[PDB]
Design a protein around this ligand. Structure first.
Ligand SMILES: CCCCCCCCCCCCCCCC(=O)O
Length: 389
């Protein structure tokens, strides 16, 4: 329990090692993005280890694949929880929801790649960036500002049922109420591979804009089918409704025009020194794995946990209490990757600024900024739910 350097050691911490857990999707709908996130975290931890680790201890990240399935995530959580100090990458809103009570009981610092409001309200869970609702509020306001929609128009929102799509949808509906828009709602599951019935329904409803809270496979299908039907409505996706791999498929033309993504994260093409450095470092380590916005997300999550570990080390306290208090002492985080945040609270989003990006085969990371990160008044005044959607 206390190392020979006088540092208190919690679960997963020995005299020479700090074990961290990663619960991701390597095989399901988010496979290429979970790979990128996971590899970017490993890149960060390797760089740290090369510089002597933390508190003289090497960081070891153990990786489990839940396949974007909540029951498997639970099983994985119970296999890791007594033997890792923290979980700096846990992919997926329903997956982390399923273990929220255990996280709280265990005092497990968890950094999801998941942005539901259902994960707010826990000291131990850092929801990074914006929440999904705030991204759709910003995004709908942007559609109106850009005259892609007007008062009285109808939005069709295709969404993964539950925490992720439902949170996004909450934002859509708030914006629609405030702005005088109608909403047509289309729930889907991650196992729905083919969007042609959804496209048919969107067309029947004569929507003016199409919103999507799903993964890359659904985005390719929906965009491709819509454009093959002559639909000209803009498409606005949540932050994970795209991977650059899709540009190497016939969906490309339906993604590089008329398709936008609302996200708190900067793409790999942003003109920031830390982004350029990351692009070079990641490309060097993993030459065969395309750069994507998951790389940014994973490197950033690793940066968050390491910052907290270093502060906890300096307090001679690599326990779960020491770690969370180190993390929650940071009111002004800015890792240089394009998403400044405040970590001292957890009853509201860490930021309310959303970028609009689009797919671009010419750009580093397969995407470019269309609108620099902004917080609409609409989003600023919105009441964000805490621990539910
Ligand atoms: C700064 C934070 C926003 C960064 C967004 C980068 C997108 C990376 C890909 C994420 C894949 C995971 C999707 C999870 C969907 C869900 O919430 O269940």
């Amino acid at each position: 329990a206390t190392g020979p350097d006088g540092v208190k050691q919690g679960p997963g911490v020995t005299d020479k090692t700090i074990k961290l857990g990663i619960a991701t999707d390597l095989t399901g709908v988010y496979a290429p993005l979970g790979k990128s996130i996971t590899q970017a975290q490993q890149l960060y931890y390797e760089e740290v280890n090369q510089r002597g680790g933390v508190c003289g201890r090497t960081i070891e990240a153990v990786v489990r694949d839940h396949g974007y399935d909540p029951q498997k995530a639970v099983s994985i959580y119970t296999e890791l929880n007594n033997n890792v100090l923290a979980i700096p990458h846990f992919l997926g809103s329903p997956m982390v929801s399923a273990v929220k009570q255990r996280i709280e009981s265990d005092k497990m610092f968890t950094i999801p790649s998941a942005w539901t409001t259902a994960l707010l309200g826990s000291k131990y869970i850092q929801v990074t960036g914006t929440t999904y609702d705030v991204d759709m509020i910003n995004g709908v306001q942007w559609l109106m500002d850009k005259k892609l929609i007007k008062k009285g128009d109808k939005l069709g929102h295709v969404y993964f049922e539950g925490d992720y799509g439902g949170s996004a949808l909450r934002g859509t509906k708030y914006a629609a109420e405030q702005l005088g828009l109608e909403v047509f709602e289309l729930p889907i599951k991650p196992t729905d591979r083919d969007m042609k019935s959804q496209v048919a329904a969107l067309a029947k409803e004569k929507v003016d804009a199409i919103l999507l809270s799903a993964g890359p496979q659904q985005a390719a299908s929906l965009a491709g089918i819509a454009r093959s039907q002559g639909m000209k409505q803009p498409i606005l996706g949540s932050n994970s409704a795209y991977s650059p791999q899709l540009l190497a498929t016939p969906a490309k033309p339906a993604l590089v025009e008329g398709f936008f993504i609302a996200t708190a994260g900067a793409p790999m093409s942003a003109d920031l020194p830390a982004i350029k450095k990351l692009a070079e470092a990641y490309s060097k380590k993993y030459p065969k794995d395309p750069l994507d916005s998951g790389v940014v997300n994973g490197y950033g999550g690793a940066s968050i946990v390491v910052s907290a570990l270093e502060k906890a080390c300096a307090n001679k306290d690599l326990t779960r209490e020491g770690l969370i208090n180190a993390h929650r002492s940071e009111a002004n985080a800015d890792d240089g990757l394009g998403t400044p945040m405040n970590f001292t609270y957890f009853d509201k989003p860490a930021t309310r600024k959303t970028y609009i990006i689009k797919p671009d085969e010419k750009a580093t990371g397969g995407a470019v900024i269309v609108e620099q990160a902004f917080e609409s008044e609409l989003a600023k005044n919105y009441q964000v739910p805490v621990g539910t959607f």
